[PDB]
Design a protein around this ligand. Structure first.
Ligand code: ZDC
Ligand code: CA
Ligand code: CA
Ligand code: CA
Length: 114
């Protein structure tokens, strides 16, 4: 199934943060309405924040996270969880190799902000 695609409420500010846990340099692309809105790049094996940003979901609300290592797309796992009908997390994991720990780039999207 498709992973890393989320429908946010339109015209809403949201946070996106990426962590790295891999010897491979992680490239995280955040697409809003099918157009690239942010790009994070970095290497860490100790969960370092490789990028954090505030974005707007625009009129479509469609947010897509893509992860590539060595120009090859990582395998993604994702879900969205809502707490007290109000607090939203869109969660992405990714695997760039064979050990299947799926933490190589971890991406957290959260809203609302402010
Ligand atoms: C490369 O060795 C594979 C890669 O990096 C490792 C340090 C480990 O984090 C593994 O999960 C990742 O796929
Ligand atoms: Ca891995
Ligand atoms: Ca890893
Ligand atoms: Ca608040």
């Amino acid at each position: 199934a498709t992973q890393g695609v989320f429908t946010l409420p339109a015209n809403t500010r949201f946070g996106v943060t990426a962590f790295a846990n891999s010897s491979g340099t992680q490239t995280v692309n955040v697409l809003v309405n099918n157009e690239t809105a942010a790009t994070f790049s970095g290497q860490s094996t100790n969960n370092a924040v490789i990028g954090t940003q505030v974005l707007n979901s625009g009129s479509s609300g469609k947010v897509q996270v893509q992860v590539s290592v060595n120009g090859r797309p990582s395998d993604l796992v994702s879900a969205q969880v809502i707490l007290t009908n109000e607090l939203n997390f869109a969660l992405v994991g990714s695997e760039d190799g064979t050990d299947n720990d799926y933490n190589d780039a971890v991406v957290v999207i959260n809203w609302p902000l402010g």
